[PDB]
Design a protein around this ligand. Structure first.
Ligand code: MG
Ligand code: MG
Ligand code: MG
Ligand code: MG
Ligand code: MG
Ligand code: MG
Ligand code: MG
Ligand code: MG
Ligand code: MG
Ligand code: MG
Ligand code: MG
Ligand code: MG
Ligand code: MG
Ligand code: MG
Ligand code: MG
Ligand code: MG
Ligand code: MG
Ligand code: MG
Ligand code: MG
Ligand code: MG
Ligand code: MG
Ligand code: MG
Ligand code: MG
Ligand code: MG
Ligand code: MG
Ligand code: MG
Ligand code: MG
Ligand code: MG
Ligand code: MG
Ligand code: ZN
Lengths: 143, 55, 64, 189, 57, 141, 75, 68, 103, 145
RNA sequence: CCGAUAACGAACGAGACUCUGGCAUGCUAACUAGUUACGCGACCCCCGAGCGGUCGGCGUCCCCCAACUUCUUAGAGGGACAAGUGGCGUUCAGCCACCCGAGAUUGAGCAAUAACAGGUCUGUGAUGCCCUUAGAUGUCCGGGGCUGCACGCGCGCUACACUGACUGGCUCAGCGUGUGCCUACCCUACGCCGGCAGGCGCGGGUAACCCGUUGAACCCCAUUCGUGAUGGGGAUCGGGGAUUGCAAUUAUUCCCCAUGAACGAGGAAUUCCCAGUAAGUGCGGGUCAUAAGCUUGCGUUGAUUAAGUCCCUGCCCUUUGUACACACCGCC
């Protein structure tokens, strides 16, 4: 009888943390979240009116596992194939000032924190919120 | 001469300012690890530098 | 009209025939008259001791 | 006992033809949960015969170069196609698959040396492994060509290939090119 | 060329060598080049032992 | 408190070293449980030794596996012989050999790869073509 | 086979045909009912899931590449 | 297949049989150790490939008079 | 008494395993607390060349490589008695480099 | 998944000078308009408050007119300046999104601009050749005999 | 190889050897690699749980305030030899099956004689003769060309889609390079500004130390799409924004918004390939101020078929025929 975020479904866990940050309307959403494309190795800015909450959810959840990740490490996680038209594809890294505006959006929500080394970790205020709703996901997976 | 335009074109970057240390040639050069030799003059001194063709 | 499909076990494999070496020779029995035996030529991998599936029979073979 | 894919038992299926009982590979000993295994069945001749027939079906479905190493994509394709067989018929698909290997492997083929105006020359018997090699090959080609630009998904065209092949209709791609081989072999017997 | 390269060859072998092979190539007399080699005794050619049994020049 | 062996298993690069203490039925990989592991079409290949041996064999141990290297599919197989050599090696040191011999003859008679690894790594690439054996197209004229 | 071009937001002669005879037979898939009547392709992913609001359709697989449905339980 | 021995293995084992027959037997792992005691073999793969042929001759010259 | 680190780099291992074993028993005889020879991963240097002086041929490449072996010994010794331990085994393929303790 | 069908389900539309398809989804129907692509249509339907699951035969003309009103002059509705087609017009200085035969004009007005100036890029439009530094030795044998 | 034997004793090549892949819970050792223990510090169920669960959070070289070496690294040895068993064989050399085992043929490196008018004088201060030497074919500077296009051919890349594109989420690698005598040009963490390419600050790394636990792609999970030259395909083309540089036009590369061409799986031909192989899929290295549709390496997912043959294309040995020896592209 725990539980934490490790022993639940990681993909469903995000859909719940994105909804948890939705109704608690203190997450500062920037003013260009509906016209930005999200990391130039892909076209067509996403099929979601509020994709910023799912990106802020997974980023927060990614900081719970490997701490100390800055803005360059979060561009590495959310990168993929850039199909170069007629040339072969390549891994090209993600977008810088959409991962920074996520990590700055949680500095005001008191979930992330600058470190002695670089990057950001979860404050003890922060993983209190992730581990609590992890019990909410596992309570629904028995039903 | 004269001094202002005898060698005035800048021999910075580019294979016009990289020469083989043995034969002073500018084609087919190996600059990896600071060899700075041509690809044929490397094969003369391949063992004398100490590279071994193992496989 | 057609002859019933008669099965047949295979004795010794007798080498490879056919221009490109695709077909063997198998010298089958019939499992009904086991005293009776006819050499034939299958294609594909054989493994002496298996069971074939012959249609019509009284065919041919040329001994290699 | 083992319930392949978690839900399909295997100690009830019957092989029709006495010939193919050592090359069709569903029964008691080597019946696994999944059709994915680090095989090592290519290192020796006839080692691929004790390879289970559901493993062999997934290995021949990932073939046109577009999708050539994608095995975990064709694990679920055979998984979905078995649930369609269950709904279309109401029977264990391990039974339906082994009734399709019987009714699609040719019993006669043709090849030898000289002239070939249409196919080949001499009527040649078929060993009971090539007709397991080729029966899987015909069912994986009828599934692939039916769904090449059709609305139908690949697990539908895999099910509708061998629901219609295990029945025997000459309305599937497999029996259409199983009786095409033995008709032309009956021609130049 | 011939008279000299004999004297080198039977100087190598008399100095305790196990085998020798001296190859002289180029414009030997005339215009077309040919090659005179002078193998005698024992000469390994392949493997790792042609790294420390045979010294070349 | 020292009843704890740690063995490993590999598949093409990926070593996965288990660890079984003396405990109560716990089994998990990198913190994630045995069922919440990756791509899940290969799930019956990773909880495979737990099924046909049983739960009472795993009832006394605490399997904990850490996995590095490899890919997604050659990680399911690394754990597959990691959690199943950890039960074999635990039963030769702390219970009798007759109980190990009757579960080794389960894990060998059904998929021998559960206790021995495949020696196939990867062949080297040559200067003839794009890969190990394959060669570049040749134009005669 | 020349052209298909048919159906979007069902006409009433097929929607009344939808809600009666499609929960009757065995294999229900958005690819087999699209070719069946005339429903384009998307409708069948959208129509067959709101028949799980009415409950005349039992779910089987629910995968991202194929959603297999069936007739409702009779016995 | 393809493991026919050469004559750096065969004629270097007939010297071992003719000179050291009392110190040997029909056991590979012992004659592998006798052969490196009585011979300077420069490599390990040539070592136990001679001794694999030494044991083939001693299940052989305990039946008839093979050379010898 | 310091905590010094000797580093031994070479291109052949059989000429380095003799020098590195000389420094171990050379300081076990002089009763020092010696952490053992720690072996770094080797560094292969793999220049590959076209092998032809011209461009004509059947495209046969030429794989040269040179491994570099690096081993390090950590001592518990003052600055004086290590100098006669250091200066007794040169063996020119080995480049003995002694670092400083505090750093 | 509608009730049955919209009663005023309009079968095609007619917007600027093109007849967009009514059966397409609205973010991909209006890409038949030249000057409006897949990236520009998805942002002018976020400036309008309409959902995108509707097709092009369900937008009422109180909503169709605003879709034309956004795309005709996008810069006054906070669509950012890096997103347009004709930014810094070579004859106006005005960032503008051409979306009509004015796109076909601007294309043609700049080709004959470079020919009237007689620059090197304009001569390779008057001649049926490649402009962007391509090699013509072994490429372009379809548009010419 | 065994044998045969007017031959006897040898030699190179083949093999051995070298490197590499697989195996060692045995050895040597590891604050520039760790692993378990244990101590604190966070969270989660709690009524309070607990030798509870999670943690790449912290610490055990300011002298113990803990030991070890499975995983990692690389040293020294072992290990596999047709050895054991059965079958066929002159019961010879050997072959096939089988047991036990990590493995019962892992891949390459080196490589003989005799040749060739094979390629290279544009690799060389390797070089013969010849040519040219001040209005120079020396050398430098500025501009242009090597890339120009009715067409033919060769190696490739991307495609023709639903076994897919799209969007979001999830989740694993291995080789390897990195501040340069001249020589200017290094890999880059983190913080902030910008939509993006990028910019400005502050560091670490001459490297198992920092980039880096190399959060690689395909794959996987969910949504949208729906057989339509379509949300397949991204050629052509306009406008704009940056970076490298002394200089970007004949577009260096990159980013953005538009333009949306053939192409529906390919005629006669023909090329590679049999196991971690083909193929898919990305990442390094070389070139590099700027840069990979090339090549050289690396992992990753991972098959179909075959364990044969001399039919085609050739090769090796023997007998035989020859008017061939410039040797059948012969001679006539
Ligand atoms: Mg990614
Ligand atoms: Mg289809
Ligand atoms: Mg030799
Ligand atoms: Mg050799
Ligand atoms: Mg490859
Ligand atoms: Mg510490
Ligand atoms: Mg200490
Ligand atoms: Mg170890
Ligand atoms: Mg010539
Ligand atoms: Mg030359
Ligand atoms: Mg000259
Ligand atoms: Mg050169
Ligand atoms: Mg010039
Ligand atoms: Mg050129
Ligand atoms: Mg070529
Ligand atoms: Mg596209
Ligand atoms: Mg690594
Ligand atoms: Mg289109
Ligand atoms: Mg210029
Ligand atoms: Mg260029
Ligand atoms: Mg575009
Ligand atoms: Mg590059
Ligand atoms: Mg090139
Ligand atoms: Mg062969
Ligand atoms: Mg032939
Ligand atoms: Mg010839
Ligand atoms: Mg005659
Ligand atoms: Mg003659
Ligand atoms: Mg004539
Ligand atoms: Zn040179």
């Amino acid at each position: 009888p725990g539980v934490t975020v490790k022993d639940v479904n990681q993909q469903e866990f995000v859909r719940a943390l994105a909804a948890f940050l939705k109704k608690s309307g203190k997450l500062k959403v920037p003013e260009w979240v509906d016209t930005v494309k999200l990391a130039k190795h892909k076209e067509l800015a996403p099929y979601d009116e509020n994709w910023f909450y799912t990106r802020a959810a997974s980023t927060a959840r990614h900081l719970y596992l490997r701490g100390g990740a800055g803005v360059g490490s979060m561009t590495k996680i959310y990168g993929g194939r850039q199909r170069n038209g007629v040339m072969p594809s390549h891994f090209s890294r993600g977008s810088k000032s959409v991962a920074r505006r996520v990590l700055q959006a949680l500095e005001g929500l008191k979930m992330v924190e600058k470190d002695q080394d670089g990057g950001r970790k979860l404050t003890p205020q922060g993983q209190r919120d992730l581990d609590r709703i992890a019990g909410q996901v596992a309570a629904a997976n028995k039903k | 001469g004269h001094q202002q335009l005898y060698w005035s074109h800048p021999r910075k970057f580019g294979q016009g300012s990289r020469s083989c240390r043995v034969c002073s040639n500018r084609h087919g050069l190996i600059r990896k690890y600071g060899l700075n030799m041509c690809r044929q003059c490397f094969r003369q001194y391949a063992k004398d530098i100490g590279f071994i063709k193992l496989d | 009209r057609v002859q019933p499909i008669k099965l047949a076990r295979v004795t010794k494999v007798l080498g490879r025939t056919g221009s490109q070496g695709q077909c063997t020779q198998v010298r089958v029995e019939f499992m009904d008259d086991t005293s009776r035996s006819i050499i034939r030529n299958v294609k594909g991998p054989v493994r002496e001791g298996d069971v074939l599936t012959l249609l019509e029979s009284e065919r041919e073979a040329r001994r290699l | 006992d083992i319930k392949l894919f978690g839900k399909w038992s295997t100690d009830d299926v019957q092989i029709n033809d006495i010939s193919l009982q050592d090359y069709i590979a569903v029964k008691e000993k080597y019946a696994k949960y999944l059709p994915h295994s680090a095989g090592r069945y290519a290192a020796k001749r006839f080692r691929k015969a004790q390879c289970p027939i559901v493993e062999r079906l997934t290995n021949s479905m990932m073939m046109h170069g577009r999708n050539n190493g994608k095995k975990l994509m064709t694990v679920r394709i055979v998984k979905h196609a078995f649930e369609i067989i269950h709904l279309l018929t109401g029977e264990n698909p391990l039974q339906v698959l082994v009734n399709a290997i019987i009714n699609s492997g040719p019993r006669e083929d043709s090849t030898r040396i000289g002239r070939a105006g249409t196919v080949r020359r001499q009527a040649v018997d078929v060993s009971p492994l090539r007709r397991v090699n080729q029966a899987i090959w015909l069912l994986c080609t009828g599934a692939r060509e039916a769904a090449f630009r059709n609305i139908k998904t690949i697990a539908e065209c895999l099910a509708d290939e061998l629901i219609n092949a295990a029945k025997g209709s000459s309305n599937s791609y497999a029996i259409k090119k199983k009786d095409e081989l033995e008709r032309v072999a009956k021609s130049n017997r | 060329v011939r008279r000299a390269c004999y004297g080198v060859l039977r100087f190598i072998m008399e100095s305790g060598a196990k085998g020798c092979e001296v190859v002289v190539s180029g414009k030997l007399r005339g215009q077309r080049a040919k090659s005179m080699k002078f193998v005698d005794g024992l000469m390994i050619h392949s493997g790792d032992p042609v790294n420390y049994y045979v010294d070349t020049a | 408190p020292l009843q704890s062996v740690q063995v490993f298993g590999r598949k093409k690069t990926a070593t996965a070293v288990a660890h079984c203490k003396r405990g109560n039925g716990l089994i998990k990989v990198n913190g994630r449980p045995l069922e919440m592991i990756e791509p899940r079409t290969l799930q019956y290949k990773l909880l495979e030794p737990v099924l046909l041996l049983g739960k009472e064999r795993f009832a006394g141990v605490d399997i904990r596996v850490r996995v590095k290297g490899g890919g997604h599919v050659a990680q399911i197989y690394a754990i597959r012989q990691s959690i199943s050599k950890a039960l074999v090696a635990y039963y030769q040191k702390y219970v009798d050999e007759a109980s190990k011999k009757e579960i080794k003859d389960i894990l060998i008679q059904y998929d021998r790869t559960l206790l021995v690894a495949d020696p196939r790594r990867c062949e080297s690439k040559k200067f003839g073509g794009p890969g190990a054996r394959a060669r570049y197209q040749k134009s005669y004229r | 086979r020349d052209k298909l071009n048919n159906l979007v937001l069902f006409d009433k002669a097929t929607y009344d045909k939808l809600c009666k005879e499609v929960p009757n037979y065995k294999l229900i898939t958005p690819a087999v009912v699209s070719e069946r009547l005339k429903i384009r392709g998307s409708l069948a992913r959208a129509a067959l899931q709101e028949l799980l609001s009415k409950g005349l359709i039992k779910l089987v697989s629910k995968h991202r590449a194929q959603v297999i449905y069936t007739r409702n339980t009779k016995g | 297949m393809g493991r026919v021995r050469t004559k750096t293995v065969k004629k270097a084992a007939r010297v071992i049989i003719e000179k050291y027959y009392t110190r040997l037997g029909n056991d590979f792992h012992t004659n592998k150790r006798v052969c490196e005691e009585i011979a300077i073999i420069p490599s390990k793969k040539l070592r136990n490939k001679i001794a694999g042929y030494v044991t083939h001759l001693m299940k052989r010259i305990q039946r008839g008079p093979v050379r010898g | 008494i310091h905590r010094i680190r000797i580093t031994l780099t070479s291109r052949n291992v059989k000429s380095l395993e003799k020098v590195c074993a000389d420094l171990i028993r050379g300081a076990k005889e002089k009763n020092l607390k010696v952490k053992g020879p720690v072996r770094m991963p080797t560094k292969t240097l793999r220049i590959t060349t076209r092998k032809t002086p011209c461009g004509e041929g059947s495209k046969t490449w030429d794989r040269f490589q040179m491994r570099i072996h690096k081993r390090l010994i950590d001592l518990h010794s003052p600055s004086e008695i290590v100098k006669q331990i250091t200066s007794i085994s040169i063996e020119p393929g080995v480049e003995v480099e002694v670092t400083i303790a505090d750093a | 998944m509608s009730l049955v069908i919209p009663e005023k389900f309009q079968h095609i539309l007619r917007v600027l000078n093109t007849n967009i398809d009514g059966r397409r989804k609205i973010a991909f129907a209006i890409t038949a308009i030249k000057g409006v692509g897949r990236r520009y249509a998805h942002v002018v339907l976020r400036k309008a408050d309409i959902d995108l699951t509707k097709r092009a035969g369900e937008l009422t003309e109180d909503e169709v007119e605003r879709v034309i009103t956004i795309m005709q002059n996008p810069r006054q509705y906070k669509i950012p300046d890096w997103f347009l087609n004709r930014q810094k017009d070579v004859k106006d200085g005005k960032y503008s999104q051409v979306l009509a035969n004015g796109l076909d004009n601007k294309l043609r007005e700049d080709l004959e601009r470079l020919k009237k100036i007689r620059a090197h890029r304009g001569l390779r439009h008057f001649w049926g050749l490649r402009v962007r530094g391509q090699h013509t030795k072994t490429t372009g044998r379809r548009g010419r005999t």
